[PDB]
Symmetry: D2
Subunit: 332 residues, 4 copies
């Protein structure tokens, strides 16, 4: 399968690295599109402020990138419809710019010639939002516009599902203490959200989270029961979802932790990790899990109010899931 | 009343500034004790990384500080019992070192000659823990060892009280996204708490909060119902308490916000502020409130699960309360 | 005189706050143009992450800001030629967008009807670059497109003049340890400068400084003898210029300091401050000086190689100079 | 040879991790002494905020660390004279506590039974200060109390030697933009140095550097010609030395670079690296070099005033040199 990445930013670049690291024979990234030159994309791929140096040899010509001797065409076409997908024989497009999340816009890749599109964020009018650990068995070959939801949703949806199935979720609220992203501002600058307009590394910033409504999409049984928010803090990568749910059946920290441990060893293996050590955010950077269930934080008040917490590398854990979904598509 | 400050650190210094700013005729700070020289204390009082320059003229001799022409004796006596309180005619001592929180240790000031001691943190074996907005009408002249609780407790106890009185609190959990303090570490260094041992400005650090058990002390009706934790983040000052409570009577965001607004205008006036603007942490630095109720964050799920959030300048808001308590003592 | 501010960003906003504080009757700010709406501009004017809350009352309508009952029209015109300067009766325009630095662009404001334009950055094709303390006396009424140079130039040029005057300059190099700005990035993102493309708050970033060339524009005598670079670091505001200069006359630390103190009490009074206390960056935020000579850093080796440093609030010290220049055009 | 590490801090821990990575058979680390317990030392060895997880398996008993099945005894003896070096058969001790820098203190390890002591900082009364790339050939078997100087000295001294060699040095000044360290403070707290007393992560802090004097210890020829200072900034690791030097011979940027590249491919191979890409601090974390010559910063004005810069991972580049010195004593 020939793959194309639209938007070689934080997610687009890490998705490429992961693909390069996996060495899957059936996945060939043939093109990369952004709004800049090959020199700049080469440099940004090579050096990373959070994730260290790219393992491979990176070179560039005026029109392409050369990674370990393989040439990848680079374009700077802000309009997806102008992209030579059809000509390049492009099968799947990873939509990671952040601006083409509506079905109408994403559809432009299919018009330009690609078969399926994966939007690396919550979407509007998509065929399906797939969160591995929740509903990847609903994906069908007829789905062309696919969404992988947000990082916070992947960090907690699989956990919400097991808690619901074991104790029954009545009401619930999550708060994600999240690192800043390129959607924020260095210093106070205009932005649609007046809080995200404020200096990123200087403030504790309450704002919104895609997880709020996305979880109900993958775990329908919980629709209308959960809500949430985000508090962006001065860390460049690494987050933690703090979930408080009112459950139906009585429990204990001991039991909640045991069911989770079971899950991470089984159905959730490699998706949700299990931790019982006093770790901090810098310790989870580079992990591939969608979330790491922190057993040292589990708490129950009155047998029914329970707090559970999930750590996650918002950039890396998520990109891994994007590549998994891409592999899912190789099976149809 | 002649007052003495033991521990001229972040809290000790701000308490002095506030006292200096209030210009209360009946409060004379006659001594300051620490573990350093007058030159260093003079400099630290004068320049502050978070709160700006001290308004007054500060000078120093080998044995004292001279603020606007008034001399304040300075000692470097690590043992409170050796302090010349009796001789100096010291009435009230502000215990702000952080190491004399047990009744036995605090009692040393009374042995050295002072009448009453105010511990600026949760205490052990104290006569009374007073949180203004919750139980300042329990303070009696027979109380010599007084505690003002922690900053997080003052940020939320007054709010917890009104919520309980209006809707009835069943179960509840709070999480405080808190700035780092001098109890943490610049870079990974030994500490009793393995998470607080980690680099302060580089990590999202879950840890403990004094508010967890201190709230039940001032609002007895809620004993055994609330629990909580802290997540220290890379900001030098400014915090927010995120409380999620299961309430008895059905409500709405509209109602919860209205009762709070009423309170801030009444009984809680000047203690708990009310906000409905999209502010961030840097905007609350320098406020005197114990907490600022953020109306833009209030949320209710299923008429009974409610989230309320309180902002606070953990250094300044709290020191103001310490001075208020000191004034309370002038009335007996 | 009627004034308009083009680009209500960090500088644009600070210039206005200063104009408002000075209460100069001969200055009426009648228009403000940016690229966003009034609600956003009102919120950004009211709250600041570094400089705290605006002293006045701020309201807004669909097309104007109302500060203390006075109305300022607000436009969102990215093309200066389409601005109604002629109709608004705009005499002077403060060009602080950062994108209209060459004469061809700056002129669009004149074409639109304004009389004089002050660019808050180095320019190309300007009639004069004026650095108060260096060449303000070269300002002629015929000057129509004026530049105030950059903040680093203003922090060190007046000092360079004096030093050259007293000991004669042979060669010199300056390095400014500079707070980050909005020209930088939150996380690794494309930028012309590949170093400024990197995560601003987590890297020590070598880059360029507009003072490398501009110093000679205002102190012609040192033309071809200086050069410099910048090192952007993780602070939101506050910078320091480290100048190492090879002088002609034999000196001593004492004489350089004495010569500078002399200057700051006379000719450079209110422009360059004098310091001899061990202060750090947070201590100089809010200062009106262009630079604060730090006597504690002065060093001379071989009686001829001298080091001097100048602290400065890159946003606020500079904006005061922008407003000073504006006041100069008032007497013409 | 049996080795003991006194002070398992940033350097102590890194020196050990390197020893462990090199797998040198002639080096057996048999003891580790600090001021805390095994559980804390084990946790701090395992997780690192800057350098990531330890590669091996770490366990602990009440009095020892067990790494990959090997046991290291752990002591908590603040007085080196009371350490059982004689009984443990300790040949060499790595003195990394930062408090036993003078000969009188360092000797307590010899009194306790060790043969040779390597201090990881500038010292007083040492037999020799050795900077590999400068004077390692002056190390004699008779040397018993050795110093590896400071990280800044190691980053620039080898370069100073070469430059002096090729163009002759007349005068020079260095300024290192340095990451903060554990000698600093989280928030304003007493310290000998009134500037280092300030909040480490929120200020640009001028302070001292051990390279101001030490460079001459290893390059005697430049004795009395250099001086320097430090500027501590809000980064956890990564530093850069900015050297402005007045040379004797007329040069050009090209020749200085060529001369340095030459050196790094030969004599300084593996000690000083060569760089010509636009890298930032985060890019040099994890490097083994003492300094990385940055060709993109080299500048010469007047054919004689030259600027050169050297990047370095102050913790890790230095520790590799500490272990290299240790390996040198092996051939004696
Ligand atoms: N950063 C995270 O933690 C994270 C995690 C999960 C999902 N996401 C989502 O993935 C998407 C990408 O976010 P990011 O953090 O990588 O952002 P980013 O801003 O670093 O990357 C956006 C990239 O796309 C490019 N781009 C923008 N418009 C373009 C256009 N019209 N055509 C082609 N290229 C264009 C930009 O130049 C940039 O390089 C967003 O929707 C985001 O919400 C981000
Ligand atoms: N910082 C906050 O947000 C905050 C808020 C509320 C309460 N508190 C509490 O107030 C107390 C002080 O904390 P802080 O943040 O001001 O800390 P700090 O570490 O800045 O201040 C402690 C000061 O006391 C001095 N000291 C320590 N031991 C001494 C001794 N034996 N005798 C005399 N002086 C000694 C230290 O030199 C230092 O100057 C702590 O219990 C803390 O928990 C802190
Ligand atoms: N920040 C400092 O320390 C500093 C100091 C001295 C000078 N300057 C200079 O001042 C200028 C502005 O700097 P800043 O730091 O305030 O930047 P900034 O990005 O905060 O502000 C730029 C503002 O102008 C607006 N703008 C951009 N394009 C526009 C257009 N076409 N029409 C109208 N408005 C538009 C943007 O929305 C933004 O609000 C730059 O030239 C900069 O080099 C900055
Ligand atoms: N951090 C760097 O970049 C760097 C680089 C080169 C050299 N150094 C030098 O290395 C030394 C250690 O520096 P660090 O940054 O690792 O500091 P640090 O504070 O992390 O480590 C010091 C360690 O030694 C322990 N210690 C203190 N007193 C002790 C005693 N009496 N007995 C036994 N152990 C004790 C402390 O518990 C701590 O773990 C200092 O001299 C420093 O100047 C630091």
């Amino acid at each position: 399968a020939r793959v194309a990445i639209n938007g070689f930013g934080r997610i687009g670049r890490l998705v490429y690295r992961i693909i390069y690291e996996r060495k899957n024979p059936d996945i060939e990234v043939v093109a990369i599109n952004d709004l800049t030159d090959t020199k700049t994309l080469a440099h940004l791929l090579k050096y990373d402020s959070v994730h260290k140096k790219f393992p491979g040899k990176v070179e560039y010509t005026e029109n392409s990138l050369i990674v370990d001797g393989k040439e990848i065409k680079v374009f700077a076409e802000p309009d997806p419809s102008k992209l030579p997908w059809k000509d390049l024989g492009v099968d799947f497009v990873i939509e990671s710019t952040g601006v083409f999340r509506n079905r109408e816009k994403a559809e432009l890749h299919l018009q330009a010639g690609a078969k399926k599109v994966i939007i690396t964020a919550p979407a509007k009018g998509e065929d399906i939002t797939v969160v591995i650990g929740c509903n990847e068995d609903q994906l069908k070959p007829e789905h062309t516009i696919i969404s992988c939801a947000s990082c916070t949703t992947n960090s907690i949806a699989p956990i919400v599902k097991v808690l619901h199935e074991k104790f029954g979720i009545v009401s619930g609220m999550l708060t994600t203490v999240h690192s800043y992203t390129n959607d924020q501002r260095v210093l106070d600058l205009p932005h649609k959200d007046l809080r995200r307009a404020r200096a990123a590394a200087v403030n504790i910033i309450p704002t919104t989270t895609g997880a709020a409504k996305a979880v109900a999409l993958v775990v329908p049984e919980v629709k209308g029961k959960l809500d949430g928010m985000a508090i962006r803090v001065p860390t460049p990568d690494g987050s933690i979802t703090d979930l408080t749910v009112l459950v139906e059946k009585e429990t204990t920290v001991e039991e909640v932790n045991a069911v989770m441990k079971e899950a991470t060893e089984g159905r959730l293996k490699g998706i949700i990790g299990y931790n019982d050590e006093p770790i901090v955010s810098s310790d989870i950077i580079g992990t591939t899990f969608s979330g790491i269930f922190d057993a040292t934080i589990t708490n129950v008040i009155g047998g029914k109010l329970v707090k559970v917490a999930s750590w996650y590398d918002n950039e890396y854990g998520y990109s891994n899931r994007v590549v998994d979904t891409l592999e899912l598509l190789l099976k149809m």
